[PDB]
């Protein structure tokens, strides 16, 4: 009978509502109210990258904190040097279409993906001199928004078909598939811990995935609008999304619930991306108004402003020793600040 | 530097040469998103088309300029999340098969959403009308009020072709964006010179807007 | 990856000779290369350096003015054209592939040389020419004139291995990184000046003869060879 489960689904939220509700005994605001502010934080754009002759997608840092990729529409994938801003690798892609891009924490491996449905490994530690195409990860019917990996021979992956895939990249074959989200997956964020991840979708909503089980643990919705970016906060107790409502919102794993929400009322355009730092108490939030707004995570306040790029700010990243912020754009350009 | 700091300078300086030589070949192209419904024509709207799911982008050589169409029909998703990626186009060739009068109300409402679309305000769109001949043979015994209750007139092939023109010309509410309406039938074969003339005059208004002219 | 020599053989004082090196198995134009030769019962000393694109060469001062290097890359060649030649140019000449970029390794792969008969700079300091030595742990040392710690962190020092009758292969790259296809056995060490390797557990073939080598300007300096033996 279809009408009592849809009576039972009604009863079951009802009831989490009732018990995320008696566990808001107190606000982030009241609790972190008498703490000293960080005032005003300027950085300033200590590199700039080109070479890019298109808008660019995605970017991912490099374990070591010196290395970068970088993804653009005119076909090319390149590897960049931040302190000399050299070149290290260009890698010519089969399709032009990528939206996506990771690094390997070896840095032996590249990730790429887009509207060709395909995660495509390439291997840059090879003889012969030249990168090659290592995989062509295939079976996702539904264009790739993002995709991160948990080891060399692991990778995650969310499909604008409503699903997040793991693959074992040697077989090529994906090990697990986790589904339950009615919209596209924009965004995904692998926990410190690499055990559990966050995807957001379009759906106006944020899941916490278990990578070794394979089941969903908990489901939240604040949001009136898609989800576009998620991070995980540094220790993996907390997660921040950021959606087209113009709104960054931080979510508490154990309270599961909502914790702070990040709006100004000049603020009326989308959020592409969103950054923690090291010690978690910056929240770098890029916008398509052209800049990025750096946040309170404690207090809601704005910090501070980044305004260096012409075109939507498409991209974000924070190196793993925190000292350097990543920042792309459609207008072809790369910056770092500090 | 060191000697290896100024070897990997010059293996940068390489790349950099490389990558300019790939954009100047690249920026020669003409790009074009070909949007319809299904079964309206796209697969068939230039004989000389070559292909080169996800993505499927062809190719061809007329009149000394390369053309690139890219059919997205595979994206069975929310275009609101991909369809920015072809801001950037030339032109948008957008395929209509008139006798289907169960498609029309999808492709109108389609091409009322792609006209309106923040990304596509100034790009221009090119309009074929398909299977003019099957029309006309069709509306012979359907006088188009199966499809249009609010029409009234001749249920012949011109004015109710004038009709369709008319209604579909009617969701472009911004100046800067012109239609090009073409009537093919299965056997024309100069769809190519067609899209060629649209192209041309597209960048000439474009070039002449950037000029202020 | 294969380097194949070619040329050589014997001629008179005064003559000229082309040696070739033909490439395969790896993406040449990308690839800088080096001739380094070998006299008959002397270590390895530096000839002739083409870069990538044939942008930046570099001679030896024993051979500048008589050595030209040049490369044919659609066909995967590496030409050394020598005249004026000598009777100090008798060697063993080996065509050395390198390639520049953070985090390379050059000097990965060494050809098999080619015979020719004919009928300021930085010291490096090799403390012994040899050490009798199976299972047991071995240290060779190597000094240079100047402080091969540059500005940037790296520390230009490179270990390779001429085992009997096969062409030197690289062990350590940067006097700490080991290089790949090589037993975590081998170790480098050292600061400024003072260099060591150590290898742990010395077995066979790992006989032969050590020389460390400096990368931090040309000419490019070996030291005269630390010879183990059982």
């Known amino acids: 009978e279809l009408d009592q489960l849809r009576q039972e689904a009604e009863q079951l939220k009802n009831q989490i509502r009732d018990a995320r509700k008696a566990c808001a005994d107190a606000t982030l605001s009241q609790i972190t109210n008498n703490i000293d502010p960080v005032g005003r934080i300027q950085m300033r754009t200590r590199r700039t990258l080109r070479g890019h002759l298109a808008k660019i997608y995605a970017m991912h840092w490099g374990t070591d904190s010196r290395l970068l990729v970088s993804a653009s529409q005119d076909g090319k994938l390149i590897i960049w040097d931040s302190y000399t801003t050299n070149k290290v690798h260009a890698i010519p892609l089969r399709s032009s279409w990528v939206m996506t891009c990771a690094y390997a924490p070896s840095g032996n491996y590249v990730a790429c993906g887009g509207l060709d449905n395909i995660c495509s490994i390439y291997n840059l530690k090879t003889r012969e001199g030249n990168v090659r195409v290592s995989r062509e990860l295939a079976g996702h019917t539904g264009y790739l928004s993002c995709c991160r990996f948990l080891d060399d021979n692991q990778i995650v992956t969310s499909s604008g078909d409503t699903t997040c895939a793991l693959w074992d990249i040697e077989t090529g074959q994906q090990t697990t598939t986790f589904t339950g989200h009615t919209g596209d997956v924009m965004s995904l964020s692998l926990a410190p811990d690499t055990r559990l991840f966050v995807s957001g979708a379009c759906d106006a909503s944020a899941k916490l995935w278990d990578v070794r089980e394979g089941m969903c643990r908990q489901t939240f919705t604040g949001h009136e609008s898609d989800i576009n970016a998620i991070c995980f906060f540094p220790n993996g107790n907390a997660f921040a999304t950021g959606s087209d409502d113009a709104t960054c919102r931080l979510f508490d794993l154990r309270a599961d619930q909502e914790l702070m929400t990040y709006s100004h009322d000049n603020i009326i355009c989308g959020i592409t991306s969103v950054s923690f730092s090291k010690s978690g108490r910056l929240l770098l939030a890029g916008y398509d108004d052209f800049n990025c707004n750096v946040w309170d995570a404690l207090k809601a306040d704005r910090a501070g402003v980044l305004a260096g790029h012409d075109n939507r700010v498409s991209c974000l990243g924070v190196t793993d020793d925190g000292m350097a912020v990543a920042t792309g754009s459609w207008d072809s350009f790369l910056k770092i600040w500090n | 530097l060191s000697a290896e700091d100024k070897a990997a300078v010059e293996r940068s300086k390489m790349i950099e040469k490389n990558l300019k030589e790939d954009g100047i070949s690249a920026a020669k192209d003409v790009k074009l998103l070909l949007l319809g419904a299904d079964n309206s024509g796209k697969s068939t709207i230039v004989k000389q088309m070559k292909i080169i799911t996800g993505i499927v982008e062809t190719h061809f050589t007329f009149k000394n300029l390369h053309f690139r169409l890219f059919d997205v029909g595979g994206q069975r998703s929310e275009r609101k999340k991909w369809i920015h990626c072809f801001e950037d186009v030339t032109a948008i060739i957008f395929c209509v098969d008139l006798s289907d009068y169960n498609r029309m109300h999808e492709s109108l409402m389609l091409f009322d959403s792609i006209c309106n679309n923040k990304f596509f305000i100034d790009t221009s769109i090119i309009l074929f009308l398909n299977k003019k001949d099957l029309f006309g043979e069709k509306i012979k015994k359907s006088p188009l009020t199966i499809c249009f209750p609010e029409y009234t007139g001749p249920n012949t092939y011109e004015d109710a072709a004038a009709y369709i023109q008319a209604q579909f010309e009617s969701k472009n509410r911004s100046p800067n964006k012109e239609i090009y309406c073409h009537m093919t039938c299965a056997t024309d074969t100069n769809n190519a010179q067609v899209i060629f003339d649209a192209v041309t005059d597209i960048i000439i208004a474009n070039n002449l807007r950037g000029c202020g002219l | 990856v294969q380097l194949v020599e070619s040329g050589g053989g014997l001629v008179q004082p005064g003559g000229s000779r082309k040696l070739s090196c033909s490439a395969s198995?790896?993406?040449?134009?990308?690839?800088?290369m080096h001739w380094v030769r070998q006299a008959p019962e002397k270590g390895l000393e530096w000839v002739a350096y083409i870069s990538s694109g044939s942008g930046t060469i570099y001679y030896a001062d024993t051979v500048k003015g008589r050595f030209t290097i040049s490369r044919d890359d659609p066909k995967n060649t590496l030409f050394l054209q020598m005249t004026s030649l000598r009777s100090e140019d008798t060697a063993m000449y080996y065509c050395?592939?390198?390639?520049?970029?953070?985090?390379?390794?050059?000097?990965?792969?060494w050809g098999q040389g080619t015979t020719l008969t004919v009928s300021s700079d930085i010291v490096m300091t090799q403390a012994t020419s040899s050490v009798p030595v199976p299972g047991e742990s071995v240290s060779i040392s190597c000094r240079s004139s100047?402080?091969?710690?540059?500005?940037?962190?790296?520390?230009?020092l490179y270990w390779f291995l001429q085992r009997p009758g096969q062409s030197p292969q690289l062990l350590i790259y940067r006097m700490s990184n080991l290089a790949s296809g090589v037993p975590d056995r081998f170790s480098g060490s050292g600061s400024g000046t003072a260099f060591t390797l150590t290898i742990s557990r010395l077995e066979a073939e790992d006989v032969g003869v050590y020389y460390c080598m400096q990368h931090l300007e040309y000419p490019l300096t070996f030291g005269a060879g630390t010879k183990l033996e059982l």
């Open positions: 050395v592939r390198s390639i520049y970029y953070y985090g390379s390794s050059p000097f990965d792969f």
């Open positions: 198995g790896f993406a040449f134009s990308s690839f800088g």
């Open positions: 100047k402080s091969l710690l540059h500005s940037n962190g790296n520390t230009y």
